[PDB]
Design a protein around this ligand. Structure first.
Ligand SMILES: OC[C@H]1O[C@H](O[C@@H]2[C@@H](O)[C@H](O)O[C@H](CO)[C@@H]2O)[C@H](O)[C@@H](O)[C@H]1O
Ligand SMILES: OC[C@H]1O[C@H](O[C@@H]2[C@@H](O)[C@H](O)O[C@H](CO)[C@@H]2O)[C@H](O)[C@@H](O)[C@H]1O
Ligand SMILES: OC[C@H]1O[C@H](O[C@@H]2[C@@H](O)[C@H](O)O[C@H](CO)[C@@H]2O)[C@H](O)[C@@H](O)[C@H]1O
Lengths: 721, 721, 246, 228
């Protein structure tokens, strides 16, 4: 049985196979249990209350009760707890608050913070509402924990109300916190860099503080809003994992603190850096939604839990189970140097190889002949497109292709009519020169005039043209914060930018819900669950190298479903890596994701065209297995591995892709075992027609054979009889 | 379905959840699969046959078939395989054989090598008989693999027949071998030392050869005939383990070889060191029984599999499910300095505290006033015992106690009437002085006159006296091998010693099957599955320190059931460690084994007596749980841990023992989770009367509280309602 | 090949002796010939490095280190082959691409630099090379005629080891006023800061002139600050730094 | 100062920056020190002699002296030492020998086994000759340790003489052995394969036995005769 229960001084937040059990102790909220379902909880794992040196107390005479030593669900500074705080509010002469629990309510169904991405399909949920108050400060803090009946996830966020007669200022307000008992733990995060997104990092939890964060105004290439706290020795198949994630695309922080007693605090939320929030009397602030997800089936377990939750409750329903079009994108193919004839020729060749969607990338607007001007000027360059965008689109439609278009709405060039008309719309500081990045500036989406302008321009573009797909780019990070009329308004502008962004994209994606929106930020610079609420796929990386893509796809699909993960067959030598890779391998690597093509098909040989046509026919068949099926990692492409292998199951279909990076010699062949088959099932391998029991494939496995050479790959395809 | 099947050129050896699948390829036997059950095996994991440099071939023209690169079940040297061989026979001018498979048979039921310890309760077994021949040498080698319907174990051994007209000499003859595919593996072994027996060692498999062995004539304190080949990252709860073990108590070797291709060979058998075996025409040789055991449930899984197999098919049925008597042993209590009055006084005190069996240790025979004489002279010292042994035994029986007696039959003192009468009975080399050890010598049990003498003397002792229990000691290792009439007979004498030992002990244990025989060799110097075939318990270690016992019991019960594992509450300061430990902790540690007492009860305070009486009452209750129940390790006492914890389940009873070695300060309490409970079960904790769901105990766990101090312990006792 | 089927003795014991007696026979043979013909340079070989030990190096002052002539596969091979044995012993040949063992394309420049960390030779059909490839080889030969004393007679310092996990190799040689450093990167990288490569065993106060840029660095700078190693995008790229002490 | 010195019951084998210091204790040879040069060695790192369980003794009454627990320069089986032996000779009905030190000599200059590759340029070397005998077996084993004045290396080999009236058979005869004190150690070896020769392997020393070997009649692609 699932939902929320209030029983004496215990609160039970009960998702499928995941419970949070909280105790109200004289107004303080204690974390009793987070993990597998327990009913009729007694307190076997309660904190033993004793006098801990230098851990102080709310009363003079009781030295054994201390907020320094109790496990909690939110953290304050100044009451005796010295662990990192998650709520900190300035009021009058202090930033000490003392919020005490006053009352609990339970909601059913749809619920979430206004103006921020939050779960959908909530009919079968309940929400615990914990109302806290600081009577002296006249502030309310309300905590929300939501259950899901079909996933081992709990969602959380908070609302702070200013009920005083004076302005107060929020300095810290995280979205989730948990104190976990002293034990050995490891943490897994996704970090990396541009052209190396979502690098899987694992390390031991150590005394002190570990954190990942972005202060870039976007979640960023080099850190994802995720942190997995794992049982010592977790594997792909076994051990406990708790994943905490944030539905937010701006500045965030995730941290793990191991304190003097060996206790462990984890939290995720808006980054304190670049953040303050003024609340006038009666104003309130709601934090982005955090998620806590649990598996006892190791890292594959947490992958499945997280992917499932995303598919059912974050990604748009219109697209979450919809096969995505195999596209051609002209960017690597032509860069800025294209015109109508070139486009239609590429379109002709795309149609012959059976590509479904044609995406016109950067350079169709203003005088965008390079990347030094024109952002902000969303006017069609009819000279370059050889007529109206309407006529181009009709040409593409008549060739039997869907039509897609690149935008970069959040940005403005100095050399643009937009900047000439409104220089103050850029994020900037009075009396400081601009800081430049790709020779462009960032629009101040905290400015409601900026949001109104973008709604208007883009609504016009989408209503007047038959566009099937949008690629929404964002190509630099935020510098030079100083657009407020006061310091405090500037401290607010990075979050207000996000609120402006989400108002913009929720509006457009809702008003034009037939269009497939793909998010992008120089590839994976903003690939988070805030964006995935509105954009059901993402350009995972500008790195289109088949081999460099292996660790990238490993990370990009670790917590996020494969269907989200844009991957394109590109030209050789690869433009990022300077590498030759077999076209077969480029195909197989991209087919572990959401397949498209990005190279000049008009300059291919007849053979290369035929190969691509064969790849497209293959993927039309594999697409449901890849995009709708269950993913199992078999060999991980980490920093030391010479191999990658990934399996997908979907009904009677099982496929396995294998890649080897460097050629080897006098080395026994790898034995590759499949997972999650029917032991008694009979599995027919397409290439040799042999029929194997599931037991054989899982417990004996495949001897993997390759010729001599680098970057070779192969695919095994099975049908269950 | 289980048993043996022969299907075309495949042989299926099918135990419960464990299969060995062998292929006959033109007379060569290939290991196709060892692991979880596969029916209708096709060969997904077959070796890919290619030309490997310097890996030679049986024929001129086929460079891709090589015994250097095929996975096999026995190993020869000289045919192209360069991995370590497991069969090597000298005949004429060579020790090259080439045994080729000729014929297979299947047996049902009881089967095993003559004169060597082998499984019992075999009604539901089948045995594959693989008959190989070397036609040139006129030798037969026959391989036996036996299935068990109720355990994931396969047993193996071999018989070599000399069908030639000339003497041949066996140089190597192991009992089991398997070639496992290249992969990452770890190995677990039990090593250690005297007073540190069965230390659990884990390490990575590396290129080259790793081995443990004994050349001591006994398996030894410092290595156990066991080797666990484990999937990388195995834990207590997860991953694959293959345990290979030998039912033999003499010289053995276990090795793991990782070759040039990254392939891995494991084998166990009689040590080549100190071994050669002459076979005259028509003679044969059978190897000891090896066992291969499998779990996919990690190290606890392999513990359970191995323990179960031992309980049901090795340990005597008369005792394997029989609760063992709580004993008093006088050794640490008095050493050699005792007489009748002292003994009966100790007996009186043992009876008052509710002890069940009284064991008279060393010093009752000949003029054994110290450890410098009398071994060999099994004549009762009636002066010291104040009358006949018959009268002493009656005195003990009348006090309501069973009676036990120490023997050391395999040994002889220079200062003894035995040595004076028969100096040639000692193991020795003509013209060399003796090597001494504890100032004694080893009898040559390869001498049939020696075996006859010991049968006679001991049969006399046991038939003329009402003895309930025997402690069978063996206190030095074998030096100075030179009793043969030829070099070859000397090379045979270490194995013949074992055959003599097993003839002796199988005879006596069978003719006197009501007596409980406990094996001993300065504690755990010979604690192996050869001895456990006849002796259902073993003195695990002379180290009776509660704290030093923790790693010892960890290892001693790792593959062997707890019921086997003698453990005694002894005096403080401890005689080996020089350590004070709480009597409570001495009790709890010994109650994780087969409980007895070994200290001078006549010199205890009234309080200490009362404590012991309480310990005895407690264990009478825990004994079935401990001895008959299922063991779960919760925290392991390894080289770095400050803690030990072990759980036992038995029907509605669950107990957990916790020990902390060093006092800690300002350190959060450990959280201890129980295993293998009913999630919905209700578990009532005796000490506080609180009732916890199994889910709470398994997923939240117990906060473990202790006072300040070293070597503290506690016990949690639960009844399921 | 290796030895199988031991059974040439008139008794079992003579057969047990025959593997050692084989060696005694071999050593009698090779000590005789190498002594009677001591002007000849004898290079030992056994499908490359099948018998590369100090028994053989007593008579054969160089050895064919490996049949694997792949520039990249050669990195761990040379690491081991020169670990206890001097570089002068260690035969290394520039061979054709794609490499015959690995099936790999590697730059001719890298094939040259890797082989020049050993005892340089060539093993490919020079008659089927382009004019350019011939010229490159002629330049490699001129370079090594100069480096040969440094490599073969100088002191070797490993700076970055090509082990199972490293993406890099670097080896330095010092010989009087000459110091050279060879650097190889196996896989192309992106958005990764350049490696800092510090030299060893220089005079702190010595002045070291780098041939490629003419800049003069103190030994302290080269040892304690080190070189920022720059490469283009691509696999199996290499470079060489050459210094003269003034 | 380098070369070989015999001082009371100590033997000093002194290469440049490397010494082997051996003690004759009633005919048994004990490894006192192998490492950096020590003159006037006193025995700070001597084995503490105590009764170790199941470690037996050459005499009845002294339980603290055991070849199972003494650090040695050659290993025998059957006298109480259970570590792997490096000399094992069959004679008559046994392969137990008991070689006891009898006499030491010092050579200067060129020296080595006949018919086997051995160092050259030996003008500035000295060789310690340790003559051992088994009087019952009538066998001689002679150990040679050679110094080099210009390198931190010592060379070794042995000669076994059959002085009996019967055929004997050598089963094991290694060229060098050292017992090192309990401590944490790693080992480096060169292994690999054809087309992957001399792969550098490093690992922790663990309880039990680790070995590399060739049974191929050549040292082989996959292991080099070296251990660090
Ligand atoms: O401008 C079109 C382009 O935008 C984004 O990526 C670019 C990248 O291709 C270029 O070479 O560098 C800059 C950074 O300096 C950007 O990251 C899109 O991700 C890309 O797909 C393309 O649409
Ligand atoms: O002699 C009786 C005694 O035999 C075995 O152990 C002894 C040990 O107590 C003594 O102190 O040392 C020697 C070794 O030098 C033996 O190991 C039994 O194991 C012991 O229980 C006792 O019965
Ligand atoms: O036969 C000439 C050849 O001999 C040795 O190597 C060969 C190798 O080239 C060949 O391809 O394979 C076999 C093994 O099956 C040998 O290893 C020399 O090492 C080589 O240089 C060449 O001289």
């Amino acid at each position: 049985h699932m939902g929320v229960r209030i029983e004496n001084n215990l609160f039970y937040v009960e998702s499928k196979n995941l419970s949070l059990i909280i105790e109200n102790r004289n107004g303080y909220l204690l974390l009793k249990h987070l993990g597998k379902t327990i009913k009729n909880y007694k307190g076997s794992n309660s904190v033993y209350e004793r006098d801990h040196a230098f851990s102080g107390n709310p009363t003079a005479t009781n030295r054994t009760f201390s907020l320094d030593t109790q496990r909690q669900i939110f953290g304050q500074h100044g009451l005796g707890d010295f662990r990192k705080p998650t709520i900190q509010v300035q009021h009058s002469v202090t930033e000490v608050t003392d919020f005490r629990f006053v009352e609990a309510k339970i909601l059913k169904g749809q619920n979430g913070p206004q103006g921020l991405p939050s779960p959908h399909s909530m009919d079968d949920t309940e929400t615990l509402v914990l109302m806290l108050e600081d009577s002296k400060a006249q502030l309310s803090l309300t905590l929300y924990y939501t259950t899901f009946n079909n996933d081992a996830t709990i969602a959380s966020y908070s609302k702070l109300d200013n009920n005083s007669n004076q302005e107060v200022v929020i300095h810290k307000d995280f979205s989730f916190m948990a104190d976990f008992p002293a034990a050995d733990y490891e943490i897994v995060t996704l970090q990396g860099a541009y052209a190396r997104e979502k690098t899987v990092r694992r390390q031991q939890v150590e005394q002190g503080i570990f954190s990942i964060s972005s202060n870039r105004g976007a979640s960023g290439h080099a850190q994802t809003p995720a942190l997995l706290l794992c049982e010592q020795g977790v594997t792909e198949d076994a051990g406990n994992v708790f994943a905490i994630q944030l539905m937010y695309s701006g500045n965030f922080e995730a941290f793990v603190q191991k304190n003097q007693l060996n206790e462990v605090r984890v939290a995720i939320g808006i980054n304190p850096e670049n953040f303050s929030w003024k609340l006038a009397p009666e104003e309130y602030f709601e934090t982005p939604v955090a998620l806590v997800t649990h598996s006892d089936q190791g890292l594959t377990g947490i992958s499945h839990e997280s992917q499932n939750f995303v598919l059912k409750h974050i990604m748009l329903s219109e697209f979450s189970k919809k096969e995505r079009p195999i596209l051609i994108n002209n960017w690597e193919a032509t860069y800025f140097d294209f015109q109508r004839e070139k486009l239609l020729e590429l379109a002709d060749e795309a149609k012959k190889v059976g590509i479904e969607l044609f995406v016109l990338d950067d350079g169709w607007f203003g005088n965008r002949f390079d990347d030094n001007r024109a952002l902000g000027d969303w006017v069609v360059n009819e000279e370059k497109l050889g007529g109206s965008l309407e006529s181009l689109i009709s040409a593409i439609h008549e060739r039997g292709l869907q039509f897609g278009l690149w935008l970069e709405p959040e940005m403005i060039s100095v050399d643009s009519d937009l900047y000439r008309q409104h220089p103050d719309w850029a994020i900037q500081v009075p009396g400081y020169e601009h800081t430049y990045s790709r020779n462009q500036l960032v629009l101040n989406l905290a400015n409601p005039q900026v949001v109104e302008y973008l709604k208007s321009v883009l609504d016009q573009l989408l209503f007047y043209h038959d566009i099937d797909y949008i690629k929404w780019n964002m190509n630099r990070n935020i510098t030079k914060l100083g657009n407020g009329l006061t310091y405090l308004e500037t401290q607010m502008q990075s979050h207000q930018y996000m609120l402006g962004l989400y108002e913009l994209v929720s509006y457009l994606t809702e008003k034009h819900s037939h269009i497939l929106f793909e998010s992008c930020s120089g590839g994976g610079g903003r690939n988070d669950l805030g964006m995935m609420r509105y954009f059901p796929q993402v350009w995972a990386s500008d790195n289109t190298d088949a081999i460099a893509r292996l660790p990238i796809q490993y990370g990009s699909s670790y917590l996020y479903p494969t269907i989200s993960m844009g991957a394109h067959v590109s030209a050789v030598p690869n433009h990022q890596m300077g590498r030759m890779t077999p076209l077969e391998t480029r195909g197989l690597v991209a087919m572990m994701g959401n397949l498209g093509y990005e190279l000049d098909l008009t300059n291919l040989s007849d053979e290369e065209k035929a190969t691509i046509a064969n790849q497209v026919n293959l993927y039309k068949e594999l697409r449901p297995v890849v995009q709708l099926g269950q993913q199992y990692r078999l060999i991980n492409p980490d920093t030391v591995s010479n191999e990658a292998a990934v399996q997908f199951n979907y009904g009677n279909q099982t496929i396995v892709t294998y890649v080897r990076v460097l050629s080897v010699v006098e080395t026994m062949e790898t034995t590759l075992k499949l997972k999650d088959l029917d032991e008694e099932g009979l599995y027919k391998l397409q290439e040799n027609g042999e029929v194997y029991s599931g037991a054989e494939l899982m417990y004996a496995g495949l001897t993997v054979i390759l010729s001599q050479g680098d970057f070779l790959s192969r695919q095994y395809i099975f049908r269950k009889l």
